[PDB]
Amino acid sequence: YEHTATIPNVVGFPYKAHIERNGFSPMTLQLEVVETSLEPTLNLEYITC
């Protein structure tokens, strides 16, 4: 069953997605972002010392 949501990129905000479906009693998911890690691609130009 394809369903879509959009959760805040807020760590520890426990967004809850509700699925309503014809055959079935509705379901609430929790989607809690425990961490994010935004990592740049790095090109080394040079070393200084």
Please identify which residue in 12, 23, 26, 40 interacts with its own copies, judged by CB under 8 A: 23
The phi-psi region of residue 12 (left if phi > 0; otherwise alpha if psi is between -120 and 50; otherwise beta) is left
Does residue 26 belong to the site contacting its own copies (CB under 8 A)? no
Asked if 4 interacts with its own copies (CB under 8 A), we say no
In the block, tokens 């949501």 appear at 5
Q: How many residues does the chain have?
A: 49
Query: 35: which DSSP letter?
Result: -
Q: Figure out which of the listed residues 9, 22, 30, 43 binds its own copies, where binding follows CB under 8 A.
A: 22
Q: Footprint of its own copies on this chain (CB under 8 A)?
A: 1, 22-23
